[PDB]
Each structure stands twice: as structure tokens, then as C-alpha cells.
């Protein structure tokens, strides 16, 4: 049944060599005989997917974790249809994405509590999809801890997206013939910098391939594409259902996060901002509540005085209706009201046909 997947999806390869070190980010013994500023598409070769399968984490686990490798230049519809149809995941009544660098090995205890209490329980009640970095690092790791903790106190499905290059122990993943089972060395002893293992809390994984040995931001384009497609997708009974709402949750970060929100805001994707998250998150919260001064302090000094960040903020404020700020309220610990308030605000309509999704969530939650 999976024989269609390799044909439909392709794994990119660097192919062309661009300046020992290589601009393509894959310094090997020798780039292909066929092999300036290296480009994602100009200097890449697309080959059929060779890492699709279902990971079975060593030791404790559910023995069910879909792992797929795909090129960035891929339609979000195909992956969504595959996830909905092949892997059997139910149509999500809600999908919430988590973004932010989450600087430091660990996050603030209150923030973690908010995440596990608010986000996970809310998703569990409505069976929402939680999409984060598919890596046991930074924000994605914290979410996995939250999901794991909630699971222990019993499920919730939380898919993951991560660039293929940064993944660790990719050898067991690589299988052109397919790997229905697969053993992953998730307990990777060497914390070799960029290379990371895969958190085993997530139920599915998307390995964005761009012909690189590891880099950040490669999945942003695909990530936004998938969110927009889902935002413009109906749940159940084909189109007879209702639109699937989507919300983006940002926690601290850097200019990359600021770029992501701006792209998401341009994508008509509602966004929510957590107060006290940190750099790249507090600045926007203050603006909703000089701009160069905040960038100096709210954002890191490097490029803080740069007006590119200020210009993005102005564009961000230009569509401030779509986004909003979740005030911690001294640790409110509840945000279903905040999420509903955001979605209704983002709707900006009156036909009441686009509010069924918000109504259902309002019903699912006790609010």
C-alpha cells in the first residue's frame, strides 16, 4: 500500500558542489561528477523518497511512529491526504503549531506548566493536532515532555516536522524498499551539536529534505504551506464538514520567529503570543500593549538597532487583528477562552457559517 509513497515523494540531493567546505552543506569525500551562492532548488537533485517508514523506538514505546522523507518543494495537499488516509489519523478538529527557539536547555517552570496544562489538555479534549519541531531539542523537547507527562496521567496526536539533514541516526531511516518496522537509536549518547535524535512522544514525523546535511529553517516554507492548506481544508464528509481552525503559538525566539509570524500573518493564519516568552515574543506583546528601543532590549542587540526588525513589526502590527497576545495573567493556566477569543477575532465575518468551527471548539471546551 505504501508503494505509492516513493513515487509521489522525492528526497533532494545537493548534487552541484558550491564552495573542502561546500556551500551545499554536505561536505563528503567527493560530490558527484556533475558537481557562487548555493541555492536550495538551483543546486539540488530530486530523487525518489528513500527513508519512508514507521519508526519503532527501541525499548518502551507504542511501536507506531510514521517516518517520511520528502522534498521541500512538495504540495501540502499530498502529505495531508496521505496522513489523513494512509496513516489513519482522524481529521483534526483543531491544529495548533508551536514555534520559538526556547533559548536554554530548560524553560521556565511556569511556562512549562502552562504548556502542559493548557495546550495538551485542550488538544486532548478536542483531539487537536500539535505540530512542532520533530526533534528532542529546545521547544520541541519541552512539548514532548508535556505530552509524555499528560499521557502518563491518562491519547493526543502531535506530529513533528524537522529537516532531514539535522536528524541523527538517519541510517536506520534510509530504506528505499521501505521500513514498516524500524529500530531507532533514540538514546543517542553523542550530543554532536546540530545532529539530534527524534523525540518519541510525537506520533508522526516529517523529514524535510533539501539536499543538506543539517540546517535550520528548511521546513519553514513547507511548514507554512501545510498550515495554510489545512486552514483551507474541511474536516470529515469531504466539504460537507467545516473549516479546520489553526492557531500558531510563539514562545520567545529570534528574528527567524519574527519572519515566521509575518509569513503566517500574511497567510491569514491566526497567531497567539505568550507573555513572558522572551526575545522575539515580548517585543510584539509590548507593541500590542520607541520601536528601536524595544528591539535593543526586547530583542538581542545584534541587529536590534537594525530597522529590518522594526519594519517587520510595523507589518506585523499592520495585521494585528489576526494575531493576539496571551497574557500570562500571573499564570492564568487556562487559555481556551484566549484561543476562542483569538479565533473569533480572526474570523472577522458575520455569515455564521465560518463560526461553526469556533462553536464546536467552544462546545468541546466547557467555555
Amino acid at each position: 500500500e505504501q508503494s505509492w509513497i516513493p513515487k509521489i515523494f522525492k528526497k533532494k540531493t545537493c548534487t552541484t558542489f558550491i564552495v573542502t567546505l561546500c556551500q551545499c552543506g554536505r561536505p563528503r569525500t567527493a560530490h558527484p561528477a556533475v558537481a557562487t551562492v548555493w541555492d536550495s532548488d538551483a543546486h539540488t537533485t530530486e530523487k525518489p523518497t528513500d527513508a519512508y517508514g514507521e519508526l519503532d523506538f527501541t525499548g518502551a514505546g507504542r511501536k507506531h511512529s510514521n517516518f517520511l522523507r520528502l522534498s521541500d518543494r512538495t504540495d501540502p495537499a499530498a502529505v495531508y491526504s496521505l496522513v489523513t488516509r494512509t496513516w489513519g489519523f482522524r481529521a483534526p478538529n483543531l491544529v495548533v503549531s508551536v514555534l520559538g527557539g526556547s533559548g536554554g536547555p530548560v524553560l521556565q517552570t511556569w511556562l512549562q506548566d502552562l504548556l502542559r496544562r493548557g495546550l495538551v489538555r485542550a488538544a486532548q479534549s478536542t483531539g487537536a493536532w500539535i505540530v512542532t519541531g520533530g526533534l528532542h531539542t529546545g521547544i520541541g523537547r519541552h512539548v514532548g515532555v508535556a505530552v509524555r507527562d499528560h499521557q502518563m496521567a491518562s491519547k493526543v496526536v502531535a506530529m513533528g516536522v524537522a529537516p532531514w539533514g539535522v536528524v541523527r541516526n538517519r541510517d536506520t531511516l534510509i530504506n528505499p524498499k521501505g521500513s514498516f518496522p524500524a529500530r531507532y537509536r533514540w538514546r543517542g549518547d553523542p550530543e554532536d551539536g546540530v545532529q539530534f535524535p527524534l523525540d518519541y512522544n510525537y506520533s508522526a514525523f516529517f523529514l524535510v529534505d533539501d539536499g543538506t546535511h543539517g540546517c535550520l529553517g528548511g521546513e519553514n516554507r513547507f511548514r507554512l504551506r501545510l498550515e495554510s492548506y489545512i486552514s483551507q481544508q474541511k474536516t470529515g464528509v469531504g466539504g460537507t464538514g467545516i473549516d479546520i481552525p489553526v492557531l500558531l503559538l510563539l514562545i520567545d525566539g529570534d528574528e527567524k520567529m519574527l519572519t515566521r509570524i509575518e509569513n503566517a500573518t500574511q497567510a491569514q493564519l491566526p497567531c497567539l503570543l505568550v507573555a513572558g516568552s522572551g526575545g522575539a515574543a515580548d517585543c510584539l506583546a509590548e507593541t500590542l500593549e520607541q520601536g528601536e528601543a524595544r528591539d535593543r532590549i526586547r530583542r538581542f542587540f545584534p541587529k536590534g538597532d537594525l530597522e529590518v526588525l522594526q519594519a517587520q513589526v510595523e507589518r506585523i502590527m499592520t495585521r494585528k487583528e489576526l494575531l493576539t497576545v496571551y497574557s500570562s495573567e500571573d499564570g492564568s493556566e487556562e487559555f481556551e477562552t484566549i484561543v476562542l477569543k483569538a479565533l473569533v477575532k480572526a474570523c472577522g465575518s458575520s455569515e455564521a457559517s465560518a463560526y461553526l468551527d469556533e462553536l464546536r471548539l467552544a462546545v468541546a471546551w466547557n467555555r
Binding site: 518502551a60 507527562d149 502518563m152 496521567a153 493556566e333
Partner: protein
Amino acid sequence: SDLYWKAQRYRLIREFHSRPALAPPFIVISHLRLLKEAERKLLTWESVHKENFLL
């Protein structure tokens, strides 16, 4: 007194839990014959309820 009895009820049960099966007149033979991750899951479960209870 009611609370005290309820408490003593355990002491009774423990006493008979370990007693040899046979009766006193035949108890002699019994005397002669006499001569992890789940825990982590459990603890997490306890804490969650505590946290909910306090909140």
C-alpha cells in the same frame, strides 16, 4: 470510637493475613511445615491529581 475501630480494622486484617491456614488444633502441622517505568508512570499520575487538587 467509630474512627478508632476503622483504624484497628487494618491491624486485624494484617494479623490474619499472615496466620497459617490451618486451625489451632491442626495448626501444628503448619508450624512443622514452617520449620520500574510503571512506577514513574504512577508517580506522575499522583502528582497530576495533587496539582489539580491544589488548583
